[PDB]
Amino acid sequence: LKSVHRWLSAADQSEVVPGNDNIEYFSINEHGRREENRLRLKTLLQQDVVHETKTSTSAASELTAVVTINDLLEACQETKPSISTSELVKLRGIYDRFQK
Amino acid sequence: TMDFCYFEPILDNVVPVLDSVTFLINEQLYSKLMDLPQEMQQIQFLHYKYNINSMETVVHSRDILTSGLCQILNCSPFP
């Protein structure tokens, strides 16, 4: 998870191929609510076929899953059992001699 | 060329007026219009350039304006 978050911290933005959010003319708003965004999106989708299922953003390698000490010591302290273990040393005590 | 067509006159004369039209233009004339300070200057220069007359001009989506240079994209509400 730490390696993934470091890798995600490298992949943390659209480093290449930003959105082509060019703005055309401010159309003469005699009517309507200047909702140009939907028409622009429909036009660009029709003209470019952005979903042609071939292009990719590829802002990072999708590889090079580096691993390192750097975060391993976040082991900190384990919430282990056997902090008190009298039951389990009595478990050994059953086999103190070879019996059973 | 071809030699005959299907035709009809539009009886009862009624024809719809479009709610909007979109035009796409080469950078030079586009910028030459966009830098104009007023709407009627743009309108009148477009009228001069393309011989478009208000009320009377028939248009369709994907109609050409000039090859290499400009075209009519879409129309509303009807195409």
Q: What is the DSSP letter of A75?
A: G
Q: Kindly provide the resolution of this structure in angstroms, with one decimal.
A: 4.7
Q: Is A44 exposed, middle or buried (0-12, 13-18, 19+ CB in 10 A)?
A: middle
Picking from A28, A32, A39, the nearest residue to B39 by CB comes out as: A28
Contacts of A44 in chain B (CB under 8 A): none
**Closest to B21 measured CA to CA, from B54, B61, B48:** B61
**Distance of CA B31 to CAs A29, A46, A63, A79, B16, Å?**
20, 24, 45, 68, 31
Token pair 């391993």 is found at A72
Nearest CA-CA distance, residue B13 and chain A, Å: 26
Contacts of A28 in chain B (CB under 8 A): 39
Experimental method reported for this structure: cryo-EM
φ and ψ at residue B75, rounded to 5 degrees:
-135, 155
Task: Using CA atoms of A77, A79, A81, A85 in order, give the dihedral in degrees to the nearest 10.
Answer: 50
Residue A41 contacts B where some CB pair is shorter than 8 Å: no
What b/e string do you get for B32-47 counting C-beta neighbours within 10 Å, with b at 16 or more?
A: ebeeeeeeeebeeebe
Q: Which of A22, A23, A24, A29 to mutate: most B Cβ within 10 Å?
A: A24
Segment (H or E) for B64: strand B64-66
Pairwise CB contact (< 8 Å): A25 & B34: yes
Nearest CA-CA distance, residue A21 and chain B, Å: 17
